[PDB]
Amino acid sequence: YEHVTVIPNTVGVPYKTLVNRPGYSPMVLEMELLSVTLEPTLSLDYITCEYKTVIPSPYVKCCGTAECKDKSLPDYSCKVFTGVYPFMWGGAYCFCDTENTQLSEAHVEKSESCKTEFASAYRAHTASASAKLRVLYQGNNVTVSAYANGDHAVTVKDAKFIVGPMSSAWTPFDNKIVVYKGDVYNMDYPPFGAGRPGQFGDIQSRTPESEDVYANTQLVLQRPSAGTVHVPYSQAPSGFKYWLKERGASLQHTAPFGCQIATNPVRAMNCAVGNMPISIDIPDAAFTRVVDAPSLTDMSCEVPACTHSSDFGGVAIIKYAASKKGKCAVHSMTNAVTIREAEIEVEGNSQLQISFSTALASAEFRVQVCSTQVHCAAECHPPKDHIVNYPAS
Amino acid sequence: YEHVTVIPNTVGVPYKTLVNRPGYSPMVLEMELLSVTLEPTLSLDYITCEYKTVIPSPYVKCCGTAECKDKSLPDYSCKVFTGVYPFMWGGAYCFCDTENTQLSEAHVEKSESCKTEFASAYRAHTASASAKLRVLYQGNNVTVSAYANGDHAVTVKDAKFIVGPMSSAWTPFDNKIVVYKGDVYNMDYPPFGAGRPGQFGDIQSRTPESEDVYANTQLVLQRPSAGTVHVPYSQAPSGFKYWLKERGASLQHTAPFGCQIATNPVRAMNCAVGNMPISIDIPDAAFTRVVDAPSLTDMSCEVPACTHSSDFGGVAIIKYAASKKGKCAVHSMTNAVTIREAEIEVEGNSQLQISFSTALASAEFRVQVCSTQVHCAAECHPPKDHIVNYPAS
Amino acid sequence: LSYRNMGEEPNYQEEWVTHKKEVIRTVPTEGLEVTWGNNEPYKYWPQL
């Protein structure tokens, strides 16, 4: 039979639902969201790393004027400081006195640790969901992980599950994401090749493994020092040193909505949002009717245990009287009840202690033993400590 | 400066944009987008191939009845035909009397050409913005191809051209798309593993060379061969063979919006729609000072010929009197007239015949030859042929 | 032979041809995109 339900989008909550078609006993299908991650549509637009400066040996035009040569590299810095009287380690580097000058040249070179240190500007498009969910089907706690777009529906254990689509989409992925080796930060990148000077991403590349890189590093080659062949070259600070060093708190710390963001692949596991539509087409063989089922007559449910706390704080002894021995659907007939048991043995004129919690302290909660219903009441005492870990019933 | 223009998002209409710089002469330029590609996000879930019923040799228990085991294959057909009288080409295949049982086992299998031809059920994502466009600007016919998100800048010819994003959204993808060997068919795929019998996509390849096959081919084992080992087994036909039979009209013919849906990778080249805001950071060398401009005054634009047609069929002998020689920027200062040239070498007291016309027959348009604003009014001719090849001015 | 609009109004009609056929397309203002055979299609700008 097909029962199409919607679990809440927050994993760990026991979703036991009493799907009960005619000709069958009660079918308390328990589902539990194992995990739901969101594959965002990335596109590496920006390649980043801390670039270096390839300043060569200085062209000491001794005895004559220097020659302007524009070497077409990224930041092709060339200058002719004519009239340089540089001295050498063995005295004088220039033989004559006046015609010595320094044609000093340098270019910008890529990060040699760019093979290791890479900043990726993911062009974050829409996100693809993918879920995992377990169900106690036939009393077997089986798991099924499916592509939860709703179109990659997973048959599992003879039961087809149509999982998804999620009701929400507010995932931690932004329009432009930055991935730096563990850091997923929603950051506004520069132009891919049209980067800005000194910002987070001044050594911009079209990809990380690419060959070209745009950069405006402020290559101010000043005139050289006195007597020493040394290219005084002003340079801007490292954007890999900047946006790495000013890396800030990422999505792993700053994940709003209670998400669990984990990149490589970009997936928000435990995105606490939405209604998860899961349709279980189950087999017909579970549906054993009243001719097959045990007949529980005279069920009296006294709630000796009742405490308004976080867990299943409600202990109710249902003294039943079963005509047939076997499994019996102990299904929740009340909306505030959270019965942990979904099936109990009905062997004779005996009692089952059903342990389910509620919210209101005076509670007339309804539970059905598989063809019997009942609305039994209890007076719950409130809890002691304020801080708990998990959610409520 | 950075001239911001918005070209019409349709190729081939070479737009002129009059970059007016104070402190310089009039600087008309021409731009035109050659092509514009729309590369959609793809999520290939279903794979299309040919299902083939791998049925084994006929397990003839001569004078003996076995028990058929459920072989876990895609549609493992297990059948024990009771009491076969199987005879061979060399007589009786069984020497026993009547107890010969036919073991008919089968599964589904992906075809060899399914390993070659696979229908790619791409889940449609956002479109990549990218386009190649030329411009006769700065005295050069130079092109820039830019990823048109807005941040893929080309500083080409010394000009920082930044185009993107596009205005339009008429995406050549649908929500689900089938790549079938050259063809993008906008078709909704079935359930990934949850197909129907006889569906376009009866063999669902959850991976492209995957190991799973969502296949319900209705392979029903028929009765046994009458005295001979023949596999009585009726199945449905190729649902991808039906999808091969119903190939369907692709967007290469079925392109709304006049788009060029061209795959490998699935792109939308020549999607004529919308507008394209492109800014051009021009350098200072394009700003050529008007005091160094030629002193062109005393213009009379004699309209020789008027034919309101597909071309720019206005002829205008503009008698000018230039102070010095020079390429005066002969740009249209009017609203309707497409001028053929962009700059004209106004040399002296000369009559430059400009080729300018527009759609309107009664055309009174202004034209600035590098400073010279002049009016030209004509009663342009009707069209000759009813049909032209593309649009015109 | 397939004729359609050159723009947003698709009108993407198409037929296999078997005899001589003098098909008269009312050429749209957005353009008549026709492909009749394995050559690339004619575009119609209904000019003038």
Tab-separated table of N, CA, C and O in Angstrom, chain C:
chain	number	residue	atom	x	y	z
C	1	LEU	N	10.777	19.886	-44.202
C	1	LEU	CA	10.683	21.332	-44.332
C	1	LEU	C	9.996	21.863	-43.084
C	1	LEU	O	8.848	21.510	-42.808
C	2	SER	N	10.697	22.692	-42.331
C	2	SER	CA	10.188	23.212	-41.074
C	2	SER	C	10.318	24.723	-41.067
C	2	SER	O	11.405	25.269	-41.224
C	3	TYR	N	9.192	25.388	-40.863
C	3	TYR	CA	9.174	26.834	-40.787
C	3	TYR	C	8.613	27.214	-39.430
C	3	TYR	O	7.642	26.622	-38.951
C	4	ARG	N	9.246	28.207	-38.815
C	4	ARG	CA	8.868	28.702	-37.504
C	4	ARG	C	9.125	30.198	-37.469
C	4	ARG	O	9.643	30.776	-38.428
C	5	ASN	N	8.737	30.821	-36.364
C	5	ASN	CA	9.082	32.211	-36.118
C	5	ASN	C	10.577	32.321	-35.860
C	5	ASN	O	11.227	31.348	-35.470
C	6	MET	N	11.131	33.506	-36.094
C	6	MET	CA	12.534	33.741	-35.757
C	6	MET	C	12.718	34.225	-34.325
C	6	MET	O	13.839	34.495	-33.892
C	7	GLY	N	11.636	34.300	-33.557
C	7	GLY	CA	11.686	34.851	-32.223
C	7	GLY	C	10.822	34.127	-31.214
C	7	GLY	O	10.776	32.892	-31.199
C	8	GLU	N	10.134	34.903	-30.367
C	8	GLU	CA	9.469	34.342	-29.194
C	8	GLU	C	8.219	33.561	-29.570
C	8	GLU	O	7.912	32.537	-28.951
C	9	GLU	N	7.497	34.011	-30.587
C	9	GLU	CA	6.370	33.243	-31.098
C	9	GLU	C	6.985	32.131	-31.932
C	9	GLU	O	7.509	32.401	-33.026
C	10	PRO	N	7.019	30.890	-31.428
C	10	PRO	CA	7.726	29.826	-32.158
C	10	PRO	C	7.067	29.409	-33.452
C	10	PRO	O	7.654	29.666	-34.508
C	11	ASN	N	5.831	28.911	-33.400
C	11	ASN	CA	5.071	28.456	-34.567
C	11	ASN	C	5.825	27.405	-35.384
C	11	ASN	O	5.864	27.445	-36.612
C	12	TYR	N	6.443	26.463	-34.679
C	12	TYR	CA	7.450	25.611	-35.303
C	12	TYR	C	6.808	24.473	-36.083
C	12	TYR	O	6.912	23.304	-35.699
C	13	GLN	N	6.188	24.810	-37.208
C	13	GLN	CA	5.511	23.840	-38.048
C	13	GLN	C	6.561	23.133	-38.881
C	13	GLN	O	7.617	23.697	-39.169
C	14	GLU	N	6.282	21.888	-39.240
C	14	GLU	CA	7.219	21.096	-40.016
C	14	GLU	C	6.480	19.940	-40.668
C	14	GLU	O	5.539	19.384	-40.099
C	15	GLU	N	6.926	19.580	-41.868
C	15	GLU	CA	6.323	18.488	-42.613
C	15	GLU	C	7.379	17.822	-43.480
C	15	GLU	O	8.279	18.483	-44.000
C	16	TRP	N	7.269	16.508	-43.616
C	16	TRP	CA	8.002	15.781	-44.638
C	16	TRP	C	7.311	16.069	-45.962
C	16	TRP	O	6.080	16.133	-46.018
C	17	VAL	N	8.095	16.271	-47.010
C	17	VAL	CA	7.570	16.595	-48.330
C	17	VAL	C	7.824	15.403	-49.242
C	17	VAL	O	8.876	14.756	-49.151
C	18	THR	N	6.859	15.125	-50.126
C	18	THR	CA	6.880	13.963	-51.009
C	18	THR	C	6.665	14.309	-52.480
C	18	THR	O	7.191	13.626	-53.358
C	19	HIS	N	5.885	15.341	-52.773
C	19	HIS	CA	5.706	15.779	-54.150
C	19	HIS	C	6.253	17.192	-54.259
C	19	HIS	O	6.918	17.665	-53.334
C	20	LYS	N	6.025	17.858	-55.384
C	20	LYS	CA	6.356	19.274	-55.474
C	20	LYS	C	5.374	20.061	-54.620
C	20	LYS	O	4.167	19.816	-54.670
C	21	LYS	N	5.883	20.986	-53.812
C	21	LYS	CA	5.011	21.736	-52.918
C	21	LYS	C	5.438	23.196	-52.908
C	21	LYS	O	6.588	23.511	-52.598
C	22	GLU	N	4.514	24.079	-53.257
C	22	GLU	CA	4.756	25.512	-53.216
C	22	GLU	C	4.153	26.065	-51.934
C	22	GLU	O	3.046	26.611	-51.948
C	23	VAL	N	4.887	25.930	-50.835
C	23	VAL	CA	4.431	26.351	-49.516
C	23	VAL	C	4.697	27.840	-49.385
C	23	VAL	O	5.824	28.292	-49.600
C	24	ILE	N	3.664	28.597	-49.043
C	24	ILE	CA	3.752	30.045	-48.890
C	24	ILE	C	3.738	30.348	-47.398
C	24	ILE	O	2.691	30.265	-46.750
C	25	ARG	N	4.893	30.678	-46.846
C	25	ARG	CA	4.990	31.124	-45.472
C	25	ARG	C	4.648	32.604	-45.400
C	25	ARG	O	5.230	33.422	-46.121
C	26	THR	N	3.683	32.941	-44.553
C	26	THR	CA	3.496	34.321	-44.151
C	26	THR	C	4.668	34.693	-43.259
C	26	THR	O	4.760	34.226	-42.122
C	27	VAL	N	5.576	35.506	-43.790
C	27	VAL	CA	6.885	35.738	-43.185
C	27	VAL	C	6.684	36.646	-41.976
C	27	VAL	O	6.127	37.744	-42.128
C	28	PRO	N	7.099	36.239	-40.786
C	28	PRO	CA	6.827	37.031	-39.586
C	28	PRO	C	7.735	38.250	-39.503
C	28	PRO	O	8.760	38.354	-40.175
C	29	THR	N	7.314	39.198	-38.663
C	29	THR	CA	8.146	40.361	-38.379
C	29	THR	C	9.328	39.977	-37.500
C	29	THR	O	10.366	40.645	-37.515
C	30	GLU	N	9.186	38.896	-36.728
C	30	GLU	CA	10.318	38.341	-35.996
C	30	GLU	C	11.173	37.437	-36.875
C	30	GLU	O	12.251	37.009	-36.456
C	31	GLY	N	10.716	37.132	-38.078
C	31	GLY	CA	11.517	36.371	-39.009
C	31	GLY	C	10.977	34.964	-39.205
C	31	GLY	O	10.390	34.353	-38.309
C	32	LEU	N	11.175	34.453	-40.416
C	32	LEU	CA	10.722	33.114	-40.765
C	32	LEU	C	11.933	32.201	-40.829
C	32	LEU	O	12.732	32.301	-41.761
C	33	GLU	N	12.086	31.342	-39.831
C	33	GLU	CA	13.190	30.394	-39.785
C	33	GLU	C	12.709	29.093	-40.406
C	33	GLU	O	11.898	28.383	-39.807
C	34	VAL	N	13.200	28.784	-41.600
C	34	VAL	CA	12.770	27.602	-42.332
C	34	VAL	C	14.006	26.781	-42.646
C	34	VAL	O	15.064	27.336	-42.950
C	35	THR	N	13.888	25.468	-42.511
C	35	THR	CA	14.903	24.526	-42.958
C	35	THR	C	14.204	23.466	-43.793
C	35	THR	O	13.342	22.748	-43.287
C	36	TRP	N	14.571	23.366	-45.060
C	36	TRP	CA	13.917	22.446	-45.986
C	36	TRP	C	14.990	21.566	-46.603
C	36	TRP	O	15.475	21.840	-47.701
C	37	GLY	N	15.313	20.481	-45.921
C	37	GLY	CA	16.420	19.668	-46.374
C	37	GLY	C	17.665	19.922	-45.556
C	37	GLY	O	17.707	20.792	-44.681
C	38	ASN	N	18.719	19.178	-45.885
C	38	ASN	CA	19.929	19.118	-45.079
C	38	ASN	C	20.804	20.355	-45.196
C	38	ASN	O	21.808	20.440	-44.488
C	39	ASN	N	20.469	21.306	-46.062
C	39	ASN	CA	21.126	22.599	-46.018
C	39	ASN	C	20.631	23.374	-44.803
C	39	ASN	O	19.565	23.083	-44.254
C	40	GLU	N	21.428	24.354	-44.376
C	40	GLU	CA	21.059	25.184	-43.237
C	40	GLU	C	19.906	26.102	-43.628
C	40	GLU	O	19.725	26.393	-44.813
C	41	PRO	N	19.105	26.554	-42.668
C	41	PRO	CA	17.809	27.141	-43.020
C	41	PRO	C	17.927	28.569	-43.525
C	41	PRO	O	18.900	29.273	-43.255
C	42	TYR	N	16.924	28.984	-44.278
C	42	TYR	CA	16.769	30.374	-44.643
C	42	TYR	C	16.049	31.100	-43.515
C	42	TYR	O	15.087	30.587	-42.930
C	43	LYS	N	16.548	32.284	-43.193
C	43	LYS	CA	15.867	33.223	-42.317
C	43	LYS	C	15.207	34.272	-43.195
C	43	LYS	O	15.784	34.699	-44.201
C	44	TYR	N	13.983	34.634	-42.852
C	44	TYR	CA	13.249	35.673	-43.549
C	44	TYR	C	13.144	36.890	-42.646
C	44	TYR	O	12.634	36.796	-41.523
C	45	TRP	N	13.651	38.020	-43.145
C	45	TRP	CA	13.357	39.338	-42.618
C	45	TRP	C	12.364	39.919	-43.614
C	45	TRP	O	12.709	40.117	-44.789
C	46	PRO	N	11.126	40.168	-43.196
C	46	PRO	CA	10.123	40.675	-44.140
C	46	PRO	C	10.278	42.165	-44.381
C	46	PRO	O	9.529	42.988	-43.855
C	47	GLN	N	11.248	42.499	-45.223
C	47	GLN	CA	11.727	43.871	-45.316
C	47	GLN	C	10.943	44.682	-46.337
C	47	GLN	O	10.810	44.286	-47.496
C	48	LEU	N	10.430	45.828	-45.902
C	48	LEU	CA	9.836	46.796	-46.817
C	48	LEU	C	8.400	46.483	-47.220
C	48	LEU	O	7.760	47.275	-47.916
